[PDB]
């Protein structure tokens, strides 16, 4: 019965090229050119213009009544995704100071709770243990909240800061409290923060990052406990919009970088903290020339290790300047290879480890610095951690690695249907001890699902690997339903990796793919580079489309039996393979999709958007301007059949704005030529992740599984059938 | 990791 709202059009022209008094980047269109945009009016930065929220409520109501009828399969698979988890939870603990810290989450409790004990105690024993910061009595009242990070001060850590953003919006506030003194109010707040946190070299200070207006990271400030934060001092400013503030601690603890990155270009700075509370003098590493990218691990105080794409090293390549003279780069490490793609580096003590990948798949490779003078040398070479399995992702857990002379490092392990496991590793013979493993109830086991690796072949003959995961008792004889994922953009490869979400597909019968398309790095960091991105950027969905092809041409799906799904910039991917080859999916979930791609990418008042002209290009531009029209998914909505779809957003997301998927769900219903559904989740209480409350986040969830269940007509799960 |  339900009718979705009809949007209203007002008049809107958006200028793309030069427009006097904007900073459009260095040669903007003049003349410029000028698009019709009806919709412009969806868009308002104060997320309270009554006609919009008027019209959002409207897509919020129709969204409840056209889902009403998969309540119960809704509730079922939240049931799962329950059982999937555990009510009482605790992290894989790590030593830092006196003690080994972890979080714990307690049932019917929806937020974390940061604990430690003393470290010759067991991490969990009531009687050892203490609470450093309870987020549920944090988020007392509200209706969100994001603890994003919770230090302690040295030297006691007694003296405890954290961040919170109570709306989504990734503006965070830095509040304090003496874990000694729990009823001590401290007075001071710091506001407007990325929600970082880095002390200085005692608990009198600390530094912070703040944003503009258009929420990019720009400024690196210290404050000083006891005073007003309008006393701060800002000891850096970056002031080009294309680069982005960063700043974080060496893991020796003596050393601050702080420094600036865009997509194309980075630029690190040093900080002694050695000097006392008053030093805020800056050492240049490399003046930034655009193009070069590098990270800097500080090995002590003398030697920079430096992880760089400088001079053709695509993939990486690691070498080792020093402290007086940090731009001599001639010492390298490991030089670039066409195979081994060098992705972070974390340096310690007396050993370093780089986390990268090799043939298609995560690898973690050590190497000891020299037992005689403690310096890492060129002739001792990466060694890689052995792994049996031909299917699977390892990460190096950096936040879990704090204490700078600890003699292994933390790696966690998975795959798509193997729980993830937390291993202490020595960088000497490799040898490992579980530190966690998790465990997911309501009957899972690991041994019900195979586990493949496929290829499918792009127009232009690349070999485009999938991933692919389905329950044992599937019958493989007959096509199936089956999900794709895809992300694609930035360099963030997808990995096989072990997630709940998929287990409510493959435990009724679906198969459940990841297409491992250009724009991710899973190949190599070129995979990315020159795969998709600029004027290459269209391979991303040709990519796609070739890889659900694939599944079809195998027989291994239909079109009838087929469901694809992305989020943020996989949401970009969901809009353009829409627009190209909906005649292959019965059913699409776009998540926090990026879809305006014309009137945001031109936009730099929009969050985002400076830093992505170096990613997609700026539209501003002749080079970019039809390129990147020839894709942007709102520009290619046209009247043919789309699937059913539905968009999961948020009022308060900073990275992809709510007005674009309300644009498109508006634009796609105005011209579609199919009598399918689109439905449009807005969640006005969350940004970009949905709800940190775990409950919530589930429910939310499982609303997006019970939709693609229901129009693959696979709701029933293969043990009750 | 300031993506979509
Ligand atoms: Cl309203
Ligand atoms: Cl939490
Ligand atoms: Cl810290
Ligand atoms: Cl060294
Ligand atoms: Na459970
Ligand atoms: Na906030």
Redesign the pocket.
Known sequence: SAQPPIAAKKPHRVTLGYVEGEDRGPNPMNPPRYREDPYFWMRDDDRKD?AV??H???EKVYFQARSADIAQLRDDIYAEHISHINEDDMSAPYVYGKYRYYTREVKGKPYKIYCRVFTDKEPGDVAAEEVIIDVNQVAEGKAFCDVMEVKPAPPEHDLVAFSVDMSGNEVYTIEFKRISDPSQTIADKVSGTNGEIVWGPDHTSLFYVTKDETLRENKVWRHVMGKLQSEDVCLYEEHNPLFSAFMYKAADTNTLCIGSQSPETAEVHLLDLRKGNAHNTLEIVRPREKGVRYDVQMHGTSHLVILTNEGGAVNHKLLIAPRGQPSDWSHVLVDHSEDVFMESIAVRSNYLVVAGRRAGLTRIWTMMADSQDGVFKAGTGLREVVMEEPIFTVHLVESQMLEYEEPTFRMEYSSLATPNTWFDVSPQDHSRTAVKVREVGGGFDAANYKVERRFATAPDQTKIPLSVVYHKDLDMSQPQPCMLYGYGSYGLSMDPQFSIQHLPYCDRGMIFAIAHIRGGSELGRAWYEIGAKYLTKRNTFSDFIAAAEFLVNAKLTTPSQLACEGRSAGGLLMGAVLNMRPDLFKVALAGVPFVDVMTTMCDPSIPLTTGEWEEWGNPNEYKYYDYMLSYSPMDNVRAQEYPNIMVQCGLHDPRVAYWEPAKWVSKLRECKTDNNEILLNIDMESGHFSAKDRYKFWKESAIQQAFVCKHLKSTVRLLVR | FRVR
């Open positions: 009554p929220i008027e959002l409520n409207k």
